[PDB]
Amino acid sequence: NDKLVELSKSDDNWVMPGKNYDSNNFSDLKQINKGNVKQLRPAWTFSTGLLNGHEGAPLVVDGKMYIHTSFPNNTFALGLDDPGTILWQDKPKQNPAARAVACCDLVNRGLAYWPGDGKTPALILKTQLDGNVAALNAETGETVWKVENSDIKVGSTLTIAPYVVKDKVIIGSSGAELGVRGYLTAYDVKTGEQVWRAYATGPDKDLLLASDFNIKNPHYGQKGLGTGTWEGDAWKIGGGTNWGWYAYDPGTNLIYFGTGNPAPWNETMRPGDNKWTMTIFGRDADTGEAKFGYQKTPHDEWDYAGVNVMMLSEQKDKDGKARKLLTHPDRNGIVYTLDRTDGALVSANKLDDTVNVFKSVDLKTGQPVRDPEYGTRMDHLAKDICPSAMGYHNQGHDSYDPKRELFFMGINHICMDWEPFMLPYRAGQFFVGATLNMYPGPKGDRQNYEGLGQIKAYNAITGDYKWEKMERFAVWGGTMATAGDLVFYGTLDGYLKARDSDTGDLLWKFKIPSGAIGYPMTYTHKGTQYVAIYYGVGGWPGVGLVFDLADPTAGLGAVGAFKKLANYTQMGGGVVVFSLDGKGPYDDPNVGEWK
Amino acid sequence: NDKLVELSKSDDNWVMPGKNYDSNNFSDLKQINKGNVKQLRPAWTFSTGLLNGHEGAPLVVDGKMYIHTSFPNNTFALGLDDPGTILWQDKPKQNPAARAVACCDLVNRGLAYWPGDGKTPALILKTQLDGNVAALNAETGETVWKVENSDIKVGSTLTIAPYVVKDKVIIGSSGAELGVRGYLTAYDVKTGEQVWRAYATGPDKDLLLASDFNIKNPHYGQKGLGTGTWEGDAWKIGGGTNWGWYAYDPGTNLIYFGTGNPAPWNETMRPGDNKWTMTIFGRDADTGEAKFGYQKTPHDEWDYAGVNVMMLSEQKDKDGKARKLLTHPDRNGIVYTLDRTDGALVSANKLDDTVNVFKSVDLKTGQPVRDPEYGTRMDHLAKDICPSAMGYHNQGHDSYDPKRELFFMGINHICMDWEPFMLPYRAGQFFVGATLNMYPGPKGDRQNYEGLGQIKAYNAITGDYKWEKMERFAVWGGTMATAGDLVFYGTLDGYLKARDSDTGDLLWKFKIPSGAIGYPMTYTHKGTQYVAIYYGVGGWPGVGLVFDLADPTAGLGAVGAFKKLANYTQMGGGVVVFSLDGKGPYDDPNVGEWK
Amino acid sequence: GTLRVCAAEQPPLSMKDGSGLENRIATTVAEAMGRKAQFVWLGKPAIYLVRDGLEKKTCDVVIGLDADDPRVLTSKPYYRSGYVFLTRADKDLDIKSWSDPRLKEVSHMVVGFGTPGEAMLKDIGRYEEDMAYLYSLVNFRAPRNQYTQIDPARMVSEVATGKAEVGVAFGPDVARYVRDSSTKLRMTPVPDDTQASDGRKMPQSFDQAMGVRKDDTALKAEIDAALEKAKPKIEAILKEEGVPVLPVS
Amino acid sequence: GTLRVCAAEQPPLSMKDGSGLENRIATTVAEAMGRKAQFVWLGKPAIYLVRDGLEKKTCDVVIGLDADDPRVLTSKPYYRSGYVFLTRADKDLDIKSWSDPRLKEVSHMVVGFGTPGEAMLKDIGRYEEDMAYLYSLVNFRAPRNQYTQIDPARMVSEVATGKAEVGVAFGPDVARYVRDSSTKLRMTPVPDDTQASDGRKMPQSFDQAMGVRKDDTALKAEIDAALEKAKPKIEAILKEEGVPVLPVS
C-alpha cells in the first residue's frame, strides 16, 4: 500500500509486524534514553484469560490497541484514553476436532491491518486454527467475509499471520507436514476471491516460475528441478511449508520469504537434493511469478527449518559501491546476505565459533562445506552436534539500527546428541527411530543446566561482533532497538531488560508476571512514550511446564534441557505497558469512574 | 499462643488472617500517607497458573512470603531479597472425584502458621478439597503429618482456613450440606490427634455445653433446645456448617465464631426455631465448652448465611463505662455489638436505610421485628426484597481504626424478587421450586445495570455514618486501614484504590490485570513499606464469566445482575506489590543474574 | 398429512434414533390415521412439554399424560401400569407390601424425587438414613430452578450391583433395562390398598392416555377412532417390550 | 513353585481381566505343569517386553514370539498363522493375490506400520494416495522416540463402516473382532508366493513359539515336555477363538 508507508512514518502508530516493510524494529523516538532509563515503571496491565504461549506484538492504529491470543484465537480492542473499557471482542466457536489434531502446538503469530479506501472501511484480517480466514471491521467488529483455506482431515492447521500488500492479502500454509506439501495463496482484501497460488515442489506449471528465473546466477538451478531431484513421485509428500515472516520492497515490487524443511524425517527414504525446499524466494506481488531462488541446505539430515526472518538494508560493500541488501539468519548457524535485485551472494558467515555441522560456505559456488564426523549415520554415536534441532536462531524478530549499521540478535546455546535404533517384533515387523539429548554449550555449565542463550551485535559486511553477552536461559522472541541508544528484550525468566547500544552494559530490569516469547513495541499517545510487551510461556521451551512432562526424552529432549524453568516461572498470559515515572491515563483518579 | 502476639507487635510480619487476634487489619506504619500517596508504583509481580478466584492475603514471616492458591490447592514460598527464585512448592495429587462433587466452589481462604518450640520446627498448616489436613515444614516444604477430616461420599468438601490457638489447630466444616450436620474439631499441632469435637444441632451431650451456659441472659435459651425446636428427627439433616472467620481473646480464653443457615431450603419442611443454627458462639479454647450463644435469625426463609467476620474492641458505652465489645456484621442487614465477657446485647443497627425486611431489632428481648409484606412463603410474587441472597455484606474482611474508633466496611447494594412454582407430571409426581431475579438498588441505575456497591465508615456506639461512597460494582474482599490516614481496597473492575480516612476523597487508583476478591496487606523489609494484593476473579460474582453461562436465571440470578462484568475484566491469577517510587530489590540490575 | 407430535429427549421413552416406546406407538397411531408423524423437538425434558409445547402453537399432540388431567383434554386410555418393586432374585428377600418389617432393616433403598415412594419413606421413618445416598446417585447439583431426577438405568444398575437392596420404580421406564439385565432381577406390583400412618390413601396404579389441546375436538375424534383400529399392534408392542400391564377396571 | 510370565497391555492379546488369548493359553500350560502362573505387569507395550523384561531379571518366560528368533531362545512352535485380507460380503470384490489390478482403483486401504503390507503398497505405487489416511486413523502424533500402531479393532471398524474397502491384518489380532462384527465380513489367506517388483520374496506366514532366556535349559525342558500334554486344550481354545490356523510342517 501507499497509505501504510505514510502511516508507518508517523510515531503514533505500529501498523504491521516489524513496523515497516523493511522489518527493522527501529524507532526514532528519543524521549527515553540512557539518561533517564532508571525511572521506567508500569502504567497499566491487562489479562487475556488463557494459559498458553503469546507471540507477536499488539498493533496500535489511530488511538486503539488490538490484542490477539492463542487458541481459541480471541481478539480484543481497547481505547488508549480509557484502557479499562473493552470496545469490542471476538470469540469464535471452532470445531472440536481442531484441538485433537494439533494439540502439540497452540499458538498464533498476529493480525493484519488494511486502511481501506473511501468506499470500504478499514479491516482487521485474522486466521483460525480450524483453517478459516476472516475479515473484521476495525471500528465495530462484525464479519465482512470468511473463507476456508486448509483441511483438518489432511492434518493442516493454521498458526501464521496474514500479510497485506497493495489491495491483496497473502497467506501461507502450516500443519503436521505428514502427507501434504505446502503452498502460498493470495486473496483480494475487499471480496475474498483467490488471485494466485504457488507451490514449493512439483512441475514448472505448479511452481509458476518466470521467464528470467535465475538469469544472473545460472548455477543455482534454473528449470525442471522441481521433479528431477526427487526420486519417482515423492514430491507429493515433500513438504516445504512456510510459517515465517515476509518482507516487501515497493521499488522492485517483490515479496521475500523462505520455505521450510522436507519430509519424511528419515533421510534414507528421500534421496536427492529435494529442490525448492529450504529456499529463499522473491516473488512478484501482482502475479506471483518468482524472480530468483536460492537453496541453503541440500538434503537436510538434522531436521532444521529455514523459516526465520528477513531484513532489508542499504549499505556499502567491500569494493565501495552502494547496494541494496537482504539479511537472513538460519537455524543451521549461517547468516546470509544477498542482493534483493537479482539474488547475488554477498556474504555468508557463522553466528558463533562453536559451529561444527559446517566448516565454511563457499561464496563462488554457494555449496556449504560439510564435516562428516558430526553428520547423522546409522549405527553410530553422533555426539556433540552444535546446534541442536532448536538451532541457534529461532522464531524471534531481530532488530537493525540504520545509523550505526548494526544487527541486534538473540542466539540460542544448545548442543545435542543423536542415536538411532531398530527394534524387531513378532511377525515381520520392525520399528526404526532415533533418540536425542540436549545440553548447554561450552560457555555455560552442564552440571546445573544453566547458560543456554546469548545476545549479540553484528555487522553484515565486515563480519565482526561489537559485543557479546550471556544469559541464564535462551533468548526467545526478539529484540527492539531505539534511537535513545537502547536495546530492549524479554527473557523466559520473567524479565524485561534494556541494554546500552554501544558497549552492552545492563541498565534497567523489571520483573513481569511470566516469561515472554514475543518482542516489545513502542509508541506515543500525547507527548508520552509507552513501551508494551506480552507475557506468557509456551511452545518448545515450555512443553514440560505446560503439559506436565517429566521424561527427558519427551519433547525431543526439550524437557531435559529446560528442566529448571519451573523454579523461576509459572504459566499465564497478558500485556504490560511501561512509561516514564508511571505517568498514564489515570493520573486523575476521577477519570473512568461511575457517576 | 504467646510468641504470636510478640511477632504481631513487630511491623515486619503478617502472621495470621487479620494480622491480630483482634482481627483489625490495622497497621501503625506511616511511611505512606496523604502527602506522598500519588507516587505509588508497582515493584514486582508474580503469576500462579490457574484461572479461578483467589481469596485471602499472603503471609510474611522472617523474610519470606507464602502464597496459596485455589483448586488444586498449590503452595509457594518466596524470598524477599530475590523474589524471582522459588524456595519450595507443594502440588498435591488429589482424587479425581473431588472435582465432580463441587463445581461452583473451587476456592480456598488461607494458611496457618505455628512458630514452634525448640524441639519442633515452625509449621505451615493447610487443608485440601478432598478433605485432608496437612502440616508442612516452614523452611524445607516436607510433610510432617496428614489426617482425614471430611467425607466426599456424603458430599462434604473443604474450603475453610485453619486457626492456630495455643498448641492447637481448629478446623470447621463446609460443603454441600444436603444431608450432613456441621461440626468443629480441634487437633494437636505437633502430632495430630483429636482433642475435642463439638456439634451445632443435637442433644446436649453432642453440643458439649458448660454448666453456666447463658447464665446472665436466661431468655436466650439454656437447655434442651437442640432437639426441642426441631420437629422429630430433622436435626440429623439440619445443617449449620461454619465457614467464616474466628476471633480469640487471651484474657477470657475464648474463641468467637458463628454458624450457618439451616437445611433444607424449603421452610415448610422444618417447622420451629431450629435452635443453635445461625448463632454466635463463644467457646473455650482448651476443653471446647461453650460460655454463651445468641441466635440472630430464627427460622430463616431467605436463605441467608451468618458466617461473616467478627471483630474486637474496647470502647465507652453511652452511660460512660468502659467495656470490651465484639462487633459482627450479618447478611440480613443488621450489625450487632455485644459484650465479650458474658454476651449482653449492647447495640443492634441497620447497615442501610433501604433494608425493609426488618423493621428494627428489639434490644430488651433480642427478637427482630418482621415485615410480612416482604416475606416469602406467601405463595405469590414478593417484590423489592432487599438484601438479596448475597446480602448487603459479603464474605470479606472489614477494618477497624482504634484512634478514630471507626469501622470501614464494604456493603453490597442489590435487591431481589421471588416467585414460587409447582409443576405436575405423569404418575403422581410433581416438582416444587422458586425463581429469583436480582437487580440494582434504588441509589444506582437499573436500565444499565450499574451502581451495585457502597463503602462506608461506621461508629458502633452512636450509630452514625461519617461518610458514604458509591461504586460501579460490588465490593468483595474487604478493606485495610493505615495510620497514615488511608483506606485501601480492591474492586471487581480491576483497580486498587486508596481513600482518605476523615473525608473519603479519592486520592490514588491503579489498574491491575484482573478483579480482586481479597484484601491488601502491608509490611516493611528494610526501611521500605510494601503493599501487596492478589488478583483473579471467580466465585459467585463471576459465575457467568467463568462458566460461560448466558441464562439470567442461572446462578440464582447472579448472571443477570453481573451481566456487564465481561466488558471490564477477564480471568487470571497472581499477586502484585507496590512501593514508593517503585523502589525494590532489583534497583541494582546485577542482583539475581547468572554468574 | 402431518401429526406434529411433541417430543423431548428422555430414555427410554424418547430418543432421536426412534427406538423408544413413544416412537413406535406414535408411528403406529399415525399410520392408522393415514398421516405421517412429524416430531417437534424441545431440548428441555418432558416436564416442560405441556407448558412450552402445546399452548405455544408449535406441536399438536402429546403422547403420554395421566387420564383426567385438568390441564389439557385427554383421550381414551390405552394401557394401565403402576409402581413395581425391584429386588435381586438370589437374595431370598420376598417382599409384597409396604408394611413389612424388613424395610426398616434394609441397608439402602432407591426411590425417585417427588414420588409416592419418597412420601412413604418419610412416613415409615427412613429419609434421614438415605437422603445422602439419594442425592449422591446424581451429582450433588439440585438447584431450585432446574428439574433433577435419577435415570432409570442408574436405578437398575444400583439394584444389580448390590449397593441398594430394594428399589421402587415405574414399569414403563425400567422394563427394557430389566429385560436385558445380566443378573436376574425380580419385580412385584405394589398393592393399591396402600395406607399411610395418618391414613390418607397413596395410589400406586395409573392409566395412560393421550392429550390434545382444548379446542381440537376433531383431532380427538380421529384419535379415538384410530385407537380401536390400532389396538392389537399397541398390545403386541407392549407385550414385546416387557411392560407389565394391569387389566383396565 | 510358581511361573512368572511377561505380560503387557495389548488388546486383544493380553488384558488385566484375563479374557485374552494370551492369558488363557498361559494359564492352561501353567496348570499342565502343575505350577501357578504369575503375571508381571510392565507399562510399555509388547514390543518392549523382551529387552526391558527378560534380560532385566524380572520375569521368566515370554509367551509369544516368532520362531528361530536370534536374540532369545525359542521353544517348540505350537500354531501357525498369517496375514489375511478383509473385505465385505456380497460386494463382488474377491481378492486372492497382490497382483489383482482392482487394487489400483480402490478408494482406500488400511495397513499397519512397518509391515510387509506397507512395503507391498510401496511396490505397486500407492503410498502417496493413502499416507494421510493412515496417519489419520490414529491422531497425527508419531514421534520418533515412541512406538505407534493402529489398534486392531479400529481396522475392523473402518472396514465395516465403509471408509476403506480392502484391509490386510494379522489373524490373531482380528479373529475375535471379525466374528463379533455386525456386518458379515470376509477373510482370505494371502499366498506365500508373493513377489515384489524387484523380485525379493515377502513371506506372509509365520510360526508361533514361546521364548525363554538363554541359560534356562531346564525350564525349556519343562516347557517343551508339557506342551504335548495340553495340546488338545490349546487347539480347542484356538478353534473357539476363531483364529485361522494353517497346517503345521
PDB file of N, CA and C in Angstrom, chain A residues 197-200 202-214 221-226 275-276 279 281-284 287-293:
ATOM      1  N   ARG A 197      -2.022 -18.825  -6.772  1.00  0.00           N
ATOM      2  CA  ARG A 197      -1.490 -19.849  -5.888  1.00  0.00           C
ATOM      3  C   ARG A 197      -0.128 -20.294  -6.400  1.00  0.00           C
ATOM      4  N   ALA A 198       0.760 -20.627  -5.468  1.00  0.00           N
ATOM      5  CA  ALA A 198       2.097 -21.083  -5.813  1.00  0.00           C
ATOM      6  C   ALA A 198       2.463 -22.279  -4.951  1.00  0.00           C
ATOM      7  N   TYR A 199       3.209 -23.210  -5.538  1.00  0.00           N
ATOM      8  CA  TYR A 199       3.630 -24.426  -4.864  1.00  0.00           C
ATOM      9  C   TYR A 199       5.146 -24.435  -4.711  1.00  0.00           C
ATOM     10  N   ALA A 200       5.620 -25.213  -3.741  1.00  0.00           N
ATOM     11  CA  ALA A 200       7.049 -25.300  -3.469  1.00  0.00           C
ATOM     12  C   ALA A 200       7.732 -26.396  -4.275  1.00  0.00           C
ATOM     13  N   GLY A 202       7.191 -29.531  -7.304  1.00  0.00           N
ATOM     14  CA  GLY A 202       6.360 -30.054  -8.360  1.00  0.00           C
ATOM     15  C   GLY A 202       6.804 -29.601  -9.735  1.00  0.00           C
ATOM     16  N   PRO A 203       5.940 -29.781 -10.729  1.00  0.00           N
ATOM     17  CA  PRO A 203       6.272 -29.347 -12.091  1.00  0.00           C
ATOM     18  C   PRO A 203       6.335 -27.831 -12.193  1.00  0.00           C
ATOM     19  N   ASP A 204       6.846 -27.367 -13.335  1.00  0.00           N
ATOM     20  CA  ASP A 204       7.037 -25.935 -13.538  1.00  0.00           C
ATOM     21  C   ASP A 204       5.714 -25.180 -13.580  1.00  0.00           C
ATOM     22  N   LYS A 205       4.649 -25.815 -14.068  1.00  0.00           N
ATOM     23  CA  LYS A 205       3.347 -25.158 -14.087  1.00  0.00           C
ATOM     24  C   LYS A 205       2.851 -24.875 -12.675  1.00  0.00           C
ATOM     25  N   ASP A 206       3.035 -25.828 -11.760  1.00  0.00           N
ATOM     26  CA  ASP A 206       2.620 -25.616 -10.377  1.00  0.00           C
ATOM     27  C   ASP A 206       3.538 -24.639  -9.655  1.00  0.00           C
ATOM     28  N   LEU A 207       4.829 -24.636  -9.993  1.00  0.00           N
ATOM     29  CA  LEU A 207       5.757 -23.693  -9.376  1.00  0.00           C
ATOM     30  C   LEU A 207       5.447 -22.258  -9.775  1.00  0.00           C
ATOM     31  N   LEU A 208       4.958 -22.053 -10.998  1.00  0.00           N
ATOM     32  CA  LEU A 208       4.607 -20.734 -11.521  1.00  0.00           C
ATOM     33  C   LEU A 208       5.838 -19.821 -11.498  1.00  0.00           C
ATOM     34  N   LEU A 209       6.800 -20.202 -12.331  1.00  0.00           N
ATOM     35  CA  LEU A 209       8.069 -19.505 -12.464  1.00  0.00           C
ATOM     36  C   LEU A 209       8.025 -18.532 -13.637  1.00  0.00           C
ATOM     37  N   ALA A 210       8.977 -17.605 -13.645  1.00  0.00           N
ATOM     38  CA  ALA A 210       9.043 -16.563 -14.655  1.00  0.00           C
ATOM     39  C   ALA A 210       9.978 -16.977 -15.789  1.00  0.00           C
ATOM     40  N   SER A 211      10.065 -16.115 -16.805  1.00  0.00           N
ATOM     41  CA  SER A 211      10.916 -16.394 -17.955  1.00  0.00           C
ATOM     42  C   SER A 211      12.391 -16.170 -17.652  1.00  0.00           C
ATOM     43  N   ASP A 212      12.712 -15.183 -16.818  1.00  0.00           N
ATOM     44  CA  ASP A 212      14.092 -14.858 -16.465  1.00  0.00           C
ATOM     45  C   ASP A 212      14.449 -15.342 -15.067  1.00  0.00           C
ATOM     46  N   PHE A 213      13.952 -16.513 -14.679  1.00  0.00           N
ATOM     47  CA  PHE A 213      14.236 -17.060 -13.360  1.00  0.00           C
ATOM     48  C   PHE A 213      15.714 -17.418 -13.248  1.00  0.00           C
ATOM     49  N   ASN A 214      16.399 -16.797 -12.286  1.00  0.00           N
ATOM     50  CA  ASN A 214      17.814 -17.058 -12.013  1.00  0.00           C
ATOM     51  C   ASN A 214      18.680 -16.825 -13.248  1.00  0.00           C
ATOM     52  N   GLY A 221      20.477 -23.357 -10.116  1.00  0.00           N
ATOM     53  CA  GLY A 221      19.353 -24.170 -10.537  1.00  0.00           C
ATOM     54  C   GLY A 221      18.325 -23.337 -11.272  1.00  0.00           C
ATOM     55  N   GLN A 222      17.994 -23.714 -12.506  1.00  0.00           N
ATOM     56  CA  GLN A 222      17.172 -22.870 -13.364  1.00  0.00           C
ATOM     57  C   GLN A 222      15.810 -23.475 -13.679  1.00  0.00           C
ATOM     58  N   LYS A 223      15.758 -24.653 -14.298  1.00  0.00           N
ATOM     59  CA  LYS A 223      14.488 -25.185 -14.774  1.00  0.00           C
ATOM     60  C   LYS A 223      14.452 -26.696 -14.621  1.00  0.00           C
ATOM     61  N   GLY A 224      13.251 -27.215 -14.374  1.00  0.00           N
ATOM     62  CA  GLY A 224      12.997 -28.639 -14.376  1.00  0.00           C
ATOM     63  C   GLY A 224      13.406 -29.383 -13.126  1.00  0.00           C
ATOM     64  N   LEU A 225      13.909 -28.695 -12.106  1.00  0.00           N
ATOM     65  CA  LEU A 225      14.441 -29.356 -10.924  1.00  0.00           C
ATOM     66  C   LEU A 225      13.391 -29.611  -9.853  1.00  0.00           C
ATOM     67  N   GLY A 226      12.140 -29.207 -10.079  1.00  0.00           N
ATOM     68  CA  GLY A 226      11.099 -29.487  -9.107  1.00  0.00           C
ATOM     69  C   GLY A 226      10.818 -30.965  -8.946  1.00  0.00           C
ATOM     70  N   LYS A 275      14.838 -30.272  -4.405  1.00  0.00           N
ATOM     71  CA  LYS A 275      14.982 -28.883  -4.813  1.00  0.00           C
ATOM     72  C   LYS A 275      13.756 -28.051  -4.448  1.00  0.00           C
ATOM     73  N   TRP A 276      14.005 -26.758  -4.218  1.00  0.00           N
ATOM     74  CA  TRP A 276      12.993 -25.779  -3.814  1.00  0.00           C
ATOM     75  C   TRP A 276      12.324 -26.173  -2.500  1.00  0.00           C
ATOM     76  N   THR A 279      14.466 -22.833   0.693  1.00  0.00           N
ATOM     77  CA  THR A 279      14.867 -21.914  -0.362  1.00  0.00           C
ATOM     78  C   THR A 279      14.383 -20.504  -0.060  1.00  0.00           C
ATOM     79  N   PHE A 281      13.095 -17.177  -1.500  1.00  0.00           N
ATOM     80  CA  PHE A 281      12.327 -16.791  -2.676  1.00  0.00           C
ATOM     81  C   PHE A 281      12.001 -15.306  -2.646  1.00  0.00           C
ATOM     82  N   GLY A 282      12.002 -14.701  -3.832  1.00  0.00           N
ATOM     83  CA  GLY A 282      11.443 -13.383  -4.054  1.00  0.00           C
ATOM     84  C   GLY A 282      10.436 -13.414  -5.189  1.00  0.00           C
ATOM     85  N   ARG A 283       9.168 -13.163  -4.878  1.00  0.00           N
ATOM     86  CA  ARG A 283       8.072 -13.341  -5.819  1.00  0.00           C
ATOM     87  C   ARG A 283       7.379 -12.015  -6.101  1.00  0.00           C
ATOM     88  N   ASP A 284       6.854 -11.882  -7.316  1.00  0.00           N
ATOM     89  CA  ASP A 284       6.098 -10.691  -7.678  1.00  0.00           C
ATOM     90  C   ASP A 284       4.779 -10.650  -6.918  1.00  0.00           C
ATOM     91  N   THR A 287       1.398 -10.861  -9.719  1.00  0.00           N
ATOM     92  CA  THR A 287       1.168 -12.093 -10.459  1.00  0.00           C
ATOM     93  C   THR A 287       1.711 -13.338  -9.775  1.00  0.00           C
ATOM     94  N   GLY A 288       2.584 -13.193  -8.782  1.00  0.00           N
ATOM     95  CA  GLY A 288       3.125 -14.330  -8.070  1.00  0.00           C
ATOM     96  C   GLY A 288       4.325 -14.989  -8.711  1.00  0.00           C
ATOM     97  N   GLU A 289       4.801 -14.480  -9.843  1.00  0.00           N
ATOM     98  CA  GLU A 289       5.925 -15.101 -10.526  1.00  0.00           C
ATOM     99  C   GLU A 289       7.215 -14.894  -9.743  1.00  0.00           C
ATOM    100  N   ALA A 290       8.032 -15.941  -9.685  1.00  0.00           N
ATOM    101  CA  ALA A 290       9.282 -15.911  -8.944  1.00  0.00           C
ATOM    102  C   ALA A 290      10.397 -15.341  -9.806  1.00  0.00           C
ATOM    103  N   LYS A 291      11.230 -14.500  -9.198  1.00  0.00           N
ATOM    104  CA  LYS A 291      12.332 -13.849  -9.892  1.00  0.00           C
ATOM    105  C   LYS A 291      13.670 -14.526  -9.634  1.00  0.00           C
ATOM    106  N   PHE A 292      13.892 -15.024  -8.420  1.00  0.00           N
ATOM    107  CA  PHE A 292      15.094 -15.787  -8.118  1.00  0.00           C
ATOM    108  C   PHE A 292      14.818 -16.688  -6.925  1.00  0.00           C
ATOM    109  N   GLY A 293      15.671 -17.687  -6.764  1.00  0.00           N
ATOM    110  CA  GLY A 293      15.574 -18.595  -5.635  1.00  0.00           C
ATOM    111  C   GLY A 293      16.939 -19.139  -5.292  1.00  0.00           C
TER     112      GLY A 293
END
